[PDB]
Design an enzyme around this catalytic site. Structure first.
Site, PDB file in Angstrom:
ATOM      1  N   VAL A  39       0.815  -1.203   0.000  1.00  0.00           N
ATOM      2  CA  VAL A  39       0.000   0.000   0.000  1.00  0.00           C
ATOM      3  C   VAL A  39       0.854   1.261   0.000  1.00  0.00           C
ATOM      4  CG1 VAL A  39      -1.441   1.420   1.489  1.00  0.00           C
ATOM      5  CG2 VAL A  39      -2.149  -0.931   0.944  1.00  0.00           C
ATOM      6  N   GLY A  40       1.943   1.264   0.752  1.00  0.00           N
ATOM      7  CA  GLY A  40       2.777   2.443   0.837  1.00  0.00           C
ATOM      8  C   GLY A  40       4.058   2.156   1.572  1.00  0.00           C
ATOM      9  N   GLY A  42       7.021   4.153   3.954  1.00  0.00           N
ATOM     10  CA  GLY A  42       7.303   5.340   4.725  1.00  0.00           C
ATOM     11  C   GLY A  42       8.654   5.234   5.401  1.00  0.00           C
ATOM     12  N   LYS A  43       8.991   6.298   6.133  1.00  0.00           N
ATOM     13  CA  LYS A  43      10.321   6.389   6.726  1.00  0.00           C
ATOM     14  C   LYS A  43      10.534   5.309   7.778  1.00  0.00           C
ATOM     15  CE  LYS A  43      11.262  10.476   7.517  1.00  0.00           C
ATOM     16  NZ  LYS A  43      11.545  11.921   7.732  1.00  0.00           N
ATOM     17  N   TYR A  44       9.487   4.965   8.533  1.00  0.00           N
ATOM     18  CA  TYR A  44       9.635   4.043   9.639  1.00  0.00           C
ATOM     19  C   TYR A  44       8.866   2.743   9.473  1.00  0.00           C
ATOM     20  CZ  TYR A  44      11.152   8.381  11.818  1.00  0.00           C
ATOM     21  OH  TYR A  44      11.789   9.566  12.094  1.00  0.00           O
ATOM     22  N   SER A  45       8.173   2.544   8.365  1.00  0.00           N
ATOM     23  CA  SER A  45       7.348   1.362   8.209  1.00  0.00           C
ATOM     24  C   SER A  45       6.959   1.215   6.745  1.00  0.00           C
ATOM     25  CB  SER A  45       6.099   1.459   9.082  1.00  0.00           C
ATOM     26  OG  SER A  45       5.244   2.547   8.716  1.00  0.00           O
ATOM     27  N   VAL A  47       3.534  -0.351   4.693  1.00  0.00           N
ATOM     28  CA  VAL A  47       2.153  -0.712   4.944  1.00  0.00           C
ATOM     29  C   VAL A  47       1.648  -1.612   3.826  1.00  0.00           C
ATOM     30  CG1 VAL A  47      -0.176   0.127   5.339  1.00  0.00           C
ATOM     31  CG2 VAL A  47       1.770   1.346   6.307  1.00  0.00           C
ATOM     32  N   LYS A  62       1.205  -3.254   9.148  1.00  0.00           N
ATOM     33  CA  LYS A  62       2.234  -2.224   9.178  1.00  0.00           C
ATOM     34  C   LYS A  62       3.489  -2.883   9.723  1.00  0.00           C
ATOM     35  CE  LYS A  62       3.194   2.283  11.335  1.00  0.00           C
ATOM     36  NZ  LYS A  62       2.563   3.321  12.173  1.00  0.00           N
ATOM     37  N   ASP A 150       2.478  14.402  14.486  1.00  0.00           N
ATOM     38  CA  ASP A 150       2.757  14.194  13.074  1.00  0.00           C
ATOM     39  C   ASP A 150       1.467  14.394  12.279  1.00  0.00           C
ATOM     40  OD1 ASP A 150       4.398  13.773  10.819  1.00  0.00           O
ATOM     41  OD2 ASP A 150       4.158  11.598  10.940  1.00  0.00           O
TER      42      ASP A 150
HETATM   43 NA    NA Z   1       6.183  12.433   9.072  1.00  0.00          NA
END
Ligand code: NA
Ligand code: NA
Length: 335
Positions: A39-40, A42-45, A47, A62, A150
């Protein structure tokens, strides 16, 4: 500085509520879940859409990138404390890989797109509705002693057909303790409040209200991001070119902060730019005197001067959406 609302939530509540570093994680069973579709990233995970392999029930998985155990426990504890609250994403399970011990968080399937994906097909009325729904999430988490830290369009998921909003990605969230000095390296640059940019470490829930103001300005003026700095120093410069430097001087003096000399030279001196100067033919249908007044009351340098989430819900801009919520709740209460 101390919060002027919800100040002592985590003073009154016992350490079991907020002492996430001591949490004994109750791990579920990794074999219950299977990734279906990415799905996506990101910087820390990363998904994924997933499924329960026993029931075929859909979920969101996640998979957390390697980080300190304390940060994982923090997100888990916050999600557990907020689960069931209005417009907060619901954590269903917590699992980890047998061999690597990498943790994954399993959430309800949200069936949604992020707020930015929706922008182009939303009208004035839809903006008022969804911002009010986001305020309900923020008032709730603040009332439970938690700052999101955030807030930004990508962390607001909307199922537009069901008119349902969820605030997601609590991985930067923290418990508010009056007196605590927090890390200022939080949020995403374009949504960072001035407190983070001038090293005011004892900030509070009001950070989230600045971030919401930035989102709101970007939506109503069709200018995304609204404050588009190229680094943390330049982010303050972009803000100062709109709010002006007289109020920045007042803020620094009030909280006994001194701008770094380099940052002082970068910021220079600027008069404010009135909000009306951002109106143009392409955004005028989203702007009203009430919208401008609401925005102005969010985007204040002094975090104590900003509207709280609950005060925002009472602003005239939301008068119709508030009345509709009150009436609905009344009928359900009579039922
Ligand atoms: Na952020
Ligand atoms: Na002030």
């Amino acid at each position: 500085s101390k919060a002027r609302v919800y100040t002592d939530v985590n003073v009154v509540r016992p350490k079991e509520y907020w002492d996430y570093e001591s949490l004994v994680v109750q791990w579920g069973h990794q074999d219950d879940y299977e990734v279906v579709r990415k799905v996506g990233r990101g910087k820390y995970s990363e998904v994924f859409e997933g499924k329960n392999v026993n029931t075929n029930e859909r979920c969101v998985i996640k998979i957390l990138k390697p980080v300190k155990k304390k940060k994982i426990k923090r997100e888990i504890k916050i999600l557990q404390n907020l689960c069931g609250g209005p417009n907060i994403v619901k954590l269903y399970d917590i699992v980890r890989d047998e061999h690597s011990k990498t943790p994954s968080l399993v959430f309800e399937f949200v069936n949604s797109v992020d707020f930015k994906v929706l922008y182009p097909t939303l009208t004035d009325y839809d903006i008022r509705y969804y911002i009010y729904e986001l305020l309900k999430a923020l008032d709730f988490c603040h009332s439970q002693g938690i700052m999101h830290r955030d807030v930004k369009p990508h962390n607001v998921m909307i199922d537009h057909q069901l008119r349902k909003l969820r605030l997601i990605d609590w991985g930067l969230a923290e418990f508010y303790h009056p007196g605590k000095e927090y890390n200022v390296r939080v949020a995403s640059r374009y949504f960072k409040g001035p407190e983070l940019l001038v090293d005011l470490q004892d900030y509070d829930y009001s950070l989230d209200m600045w971030s919401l103001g930035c989102m709101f300005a970007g939506m109503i003026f069709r200018k995304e991001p609204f404050f588009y700095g190229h680094d943390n120093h330049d982010q303050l410069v972009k803000i100062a070119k709109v709010l002006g430097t007289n109020e920045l001087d007042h803020y620094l003096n009030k909280y006994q902060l001194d701008l770094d000399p380099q940052l002082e030279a970068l910021v220079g001196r600027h008069v404010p730019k009135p909000w009306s100067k951002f109106i143009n033919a392409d955004n005028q249908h989203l702007v009203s005197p009430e919208a401008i007044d609401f925005l102005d009351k969010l985007l204040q340098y002094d975090h104590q001067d900003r509207l709280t989430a609950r005060e925002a819900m009472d602003h005239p801009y939301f008068a119709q959406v508030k009345a509709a919520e009150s009436s609905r709740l009344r009928t359900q209460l009579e039922h």
